[PDB]
Amino acid sequence: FAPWIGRQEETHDQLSRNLVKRIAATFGEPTPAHGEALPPLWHWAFFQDPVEAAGLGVDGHPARGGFLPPADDRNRMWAGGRLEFHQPLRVGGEASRTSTILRVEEKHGRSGALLFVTLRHDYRQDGQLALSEEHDIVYREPTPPKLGGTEALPEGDWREALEPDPVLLFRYSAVTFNGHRIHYDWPYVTDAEGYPGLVVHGPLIATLALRAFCRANPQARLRRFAYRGLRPLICPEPFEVGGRLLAAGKAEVWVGNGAGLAQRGDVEFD
Amino acid sequence: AFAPWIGRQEETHDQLSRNLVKRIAATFGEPTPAHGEALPPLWHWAFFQDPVEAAGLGVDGHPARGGFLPPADDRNRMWAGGRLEFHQPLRVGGEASRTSTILRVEEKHGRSGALLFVTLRHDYRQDGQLALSEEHDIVYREPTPPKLGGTEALPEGDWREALEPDPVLLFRYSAVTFNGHRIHYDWPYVTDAEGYPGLVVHGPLIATLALRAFCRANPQARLRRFAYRGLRPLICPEPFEVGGRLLAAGKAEVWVGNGAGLAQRGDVEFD
C-alpha cells in the first residue's frame, strides 16, 4: 500500500562540464560552455543516486527501496512524462531537485495488475525554478514483450534518420549511470527477457525526438513536452525521429521505424 | 627513429567532482568520500576524460585516432602495466591538472616478432602540490587470437578476496571511466569480432581491486608506490581471487588470478 503520497525528498548536484562533455560526445554535439544552457533533457544525466550492487536486482536496476518503495516481483516501466520548461539550467552551476510523490493509483489493463505512480521533479538553480517535470512509473508483473501491430510512421514536417549501435546505447546508460541490462547485456536481454536484441532507451529517443523539433523550429522557444512509449526499439535497427506542427505553438513528435512507432510526443512552444 | 612522439607533452584539467565520485563508490560498494577528503587510490582513472564524438570512434569503440600516443597500424594496443608514486592524496571536489609526457618509444624484436613499447608519464597537481606521478606501459601487439592460458600460479597469501564479476560490474566501471572499448560490455562483438570466450574484465578494474584488498588487509599502511603488470585477460563471469602477501617491513606483492593462473600481479611499498 502507498501512504507515500505527498512525500518529498531533496537532492543537489553540480552541472559539471566534465560530465556535460560526455553527454555532448554521446550525442555528437558541442559541449556548452560554463554559464550556457544545458540542452533540453540533458538534466536526466544528473541528480543520480547510485545504488550499491547489493541494492540492485538481477535486471541491474535498483531493487532496493528508498524514496520509493521496494520492488522485486514487479518491474518499473518508463510509461511517460510531462516537462514544463521555464529557464535553461546553466552548465557549471550547482542545482537542486525537489521531488514529490503525487499519485499512487491502482489500475488494470492487459495482464491486469498495473500500479501507476506519478512523481514530480522541481529543478532549481539559484532558487529559481528552471523546469518542472512529472514522470509516470508503472509497476507490473514481468510479461514477455508485447506482440502485435502499432501505428505507422506518419509523414511529417521534419525527419532525422538514426543508425544505433551498442556504443551509442552504452554511452547513454553510462551518462545516466543506468545499470538496466536491457541496454547493454545482449545475452541477458535475449535469453532472460523476450527481446530480439538491445533496447534503445526511451529517454535517449525522447531526447532525439525533442532535439529534432528544436533543430527544425530554431525560432521556437520551448514551453512544454510530453512523451509516451509504445513499443521498444531494438538495436541495431535503423530508426527515425520526426514530427509535425499542429496548431499555434503546438507540435507532435514521434520515434519509429518499419516495425512501427516506438514513441510519440507533444510539444508546446512560443 | 621515433622522434615525432618521444618527448610529447600535454596538460589537461578536470574537476574531481563528487557526482562522478558517488558513481565510483557505488560501483565498488564503498563509502563516498566527502568534499575535500582523499580520492581513494586509483579512482583518478575515472577523471581526465576528453571523449570523442561518435564519428571519431573506431569499430572497437575506442577513439579512432588519439593524437598523443603513436598510431596503432591496425595493431592491438595493450595496457601492459605501470607504476604509481603517491605523494599526497588528490582531493574530492577540487580542480586538478594532469601533465602527460611520452617518455619512451622502442621497437623490440622478440618471439612473435617486434611490437611497440610506449611509456607514458602522468603528473597530477592540485592546489599547487604534486600529488601523484604515474606511468603506463603500452604494448602494440599484432592482432592475434586471444591467448588465455595463465603461466604464473596463483599463490597462497596473507589475505584473499573472492570476486564473482558480472556484466553490471563491468558496465559500471566502463561507465564511470566513459570507456567505449566494447570488449567490456558488447558480448556479440568481443566474441564474434575479437574472439574472446566472453567479456573482458578491465585491467584497471582488477588493479583497483588488488590495491584495495591490500589496504583492507593492512589498514595502517600509507601507500607510497604501486607497480602492476597484466599477465592475461580475465573473462566474465569467471570467479577470481585478489590476494597478496607482505614481503618486508614496507613491501608487499599483490596479484589477481584463479585456478588457471595469475591474471595480473603487482608490487606495493608503504609506511
Side-chain angles (χ1 to χ4, degrees):
Chain A
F1 193 81
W4 272 259
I5 298 81
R7 210 152 119 84
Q8 288 188 338
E9 84 172 7
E10 217 67 12
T11 296
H12 305 88
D13 198 357
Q14 215 188 43
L15 311 188
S16 351
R17 206 158 183 278
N18 48 15
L19 299 183
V20 177
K21 265 147 51 206
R22 307 191 177 180
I23 316 175
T26 303
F27 284 105
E29 315 171 26
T31 298
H34 206 281
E36 311 180 20
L38 194 63
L41 292 184
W42 286 15
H43 70 284
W44 286 337
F46 293 93
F47 305 92
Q48 298 307 307
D49 54 338
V51 179
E52 66 291 339
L56 295 172
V58 187
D59 76 351
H61 262 328
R64 218 193 58 205
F67 190 42
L68 290 179
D72 190 72
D73 170 60
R74 293 172 146 91
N75 264 352
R76 299 207 291 284
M77 306 270 120
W78 202 71
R82 305 150 296 279
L83 295 103
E84 228 210 326
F85 302 90
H86 297 281
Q87 283 162 22
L89 285 163
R90 302 291 181 166
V91 176
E94 271 271 335
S96 86
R97 184 184 70 168
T98 305
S99 284
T100 293
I101 308 195
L102 281 182
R103 314 161 216 154
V104 203
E105 54 158 342
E106 275 121 338
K107 290 182 127 156
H108 180 297
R110 295 157 228 85
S111 297
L114 273 195
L115 164 77
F116 283 71
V117 171
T118 286
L119 300 180
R120 206 216 296 285
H121 295 299
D122 292 320
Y123 291 98
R124 291 192 195 76
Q125 212 164 19
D126 273 293
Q128 304 195 12
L129 172 58
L131 172 77
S132 185
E133 184 187 352
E134 283 171 14
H135 182 64
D136 282 328
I137 320 182
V138 195
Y139 295 84
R140 58 145 46 72
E141 277 257 23
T143 60
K146 171 179 75 57
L147 296 187
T150 168
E151 304 114 311
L153 263 176
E155 39 215 353
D157 295 334
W158 59 88
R159 112 190 241 285
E160 289 192 10
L162 287 105
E163 336 217 347
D165 65 50
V167 182
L168 173 66
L169 274 55
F170 156 77
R171 313 240 271 188
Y172 192 81
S173 286
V175 145
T176 58
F177 204 64
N178 187 350
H180 205 4
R181 302 163 67 180
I182 68 192
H183 305 306
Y184 55 86
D185 189 351
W186 182 87
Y188 169 89
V189 79
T190 52
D191 304 338
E193 308 206 8
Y195 299 95
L198 294 185
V199 175
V200 193
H201 324 42
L204 168 53
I205 53 194
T207 310
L208 297 173
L210 184 59
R211 177 179 76 175
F213 166 87
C214 294
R215 263 161 189 199
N217 305 267
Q219 319 208 334
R221 189 216 173 99
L222 276 175
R223 185 223 319 277
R224 215 185 85 102
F225 178 56
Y227 55 98
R228 186 184 22 102
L230 297 184
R231 67 154 190 71
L233 214 49
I234 298 307
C235 186
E237 197 167 345
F239 71 87
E240 152 176 9
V241 308
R244 72 196 188 202
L245 297 176
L246 288 177
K250 292 205 227 151
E252 93 177 347
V253 295
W254 52 75
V255 187
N257 55 15
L261 282 179
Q263 186 187 89
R264 284 225 204 216
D266 309 62
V267 179
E268 294 193 1
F269 60 88
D270 309 322
Chain B
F2 263 98
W5 314 263
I6 287 162
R8 213 170 273 198
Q9 216 179 56
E10 76 176 11
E11 216 206 328
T12 36
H13 292 265
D14 190 11
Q15 191 206 145
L16 304 181
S17 31
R18 249 177 115 251
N19 44 18
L20 186 77
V21 167
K22 281 140 76 84
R23 300 168 194 203
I24 309 169
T27 299
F28 284 115
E30 283 177 55
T32 293
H35 193 279
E37 315 206 270
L39 193 56
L42 297 181
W43 292 21
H44 68 301
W45 281 343
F47 293 81
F48 300 103
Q49 304 300 340
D50 196 54
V52 179
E53 63 169 346
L57 289 182
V59 185
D60 68 4
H62 275 149
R65 308 273 193 277
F68 193 59
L69 283 189
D73 299 326
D74 302 319
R75 289 188 305 279
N76 226 38
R77 190 182 54 82
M78 302 310 266
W79 198 58
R83 292 153 300 284
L84 305 97
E85 193 149 300
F86 311 90
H87 311 125
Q88 291 172 42
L90 282 186
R91 268 150 223 294
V92 176
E95 182 73 15
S97 79
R98 196 186 62 171
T99 305
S100 310
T101 311
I102 296 170
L103 301 191
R104 284 171 244 123
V105 179
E106 282 142 11
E107 189 179 1
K108 272 94 117 56
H109 300 267
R111 209 187 59 77
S112 314
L115 72 95
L116 196 63
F117 308 86
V118 177
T119 295
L120 163 48
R121 167 74 150 253
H122 288 295
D123 290 330
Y124 303 86
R125 279 173 259 250
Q126 173 165 68
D127 303 323
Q129 305 283 321
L130 172 51
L132 163 66
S133 310
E134 167 182 20
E135 282 166 17
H136 294 308
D137 292 338
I138 305 112
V139 164
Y140 290 73
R141 236 147 171 169
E142 210 66 89
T144 287
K147 178 182 69 70
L148 297 176
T151 307
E152 296 185 28
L154 165 56
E156 190 155 320
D158 296 353
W159 62 91
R160 174 224 163 88
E161 284 183 353
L163 275 182
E164 302 138 58
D166 80 318
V168 179
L169 178 79
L170 280 57
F171 156 72
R172 269 171 158 192
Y173 191 79
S174 286
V176 157
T177 73
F178 209 49
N179 186 351
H181 203 191
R182 43 150 102 181
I183 77 173
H184 305 303
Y185 60 77
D186 180 342
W187 192 93
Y189 173 92
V190 61
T191 54
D192 276 330
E194 306 223 4
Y196 294 81
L199 302 172
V200 184
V201 193
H202 327 53
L205 174 46
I206 270 174
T208 306
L209 288 176
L211 200 60
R212 186 179 70 171
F214 159 88
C215 289
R216 277 168 184 175
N218 297 269
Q220 294 313 316
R222 182 174 298 147
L223 293 180
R224 288 189 74 89
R225 288 164 192 176
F226 178 51
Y228 56 101
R229 194 207 283 93
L231 303 163
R232 74 163 159 100
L234 280 169
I235 298 295
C236 191
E238 261 182 302
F240 65 97
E241 168 182 324
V242 314
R245 74 165 105 142
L246 268 36
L247 287 174
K251 308 208 188 230
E253 57 188 345
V254 303
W255 58 66
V256 186
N258 63 24
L262 286 194
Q264 169 183 116
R265 51 160 333 267
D267 305 279
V268 181
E269 295 187 356
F270 58 98
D271 298 329

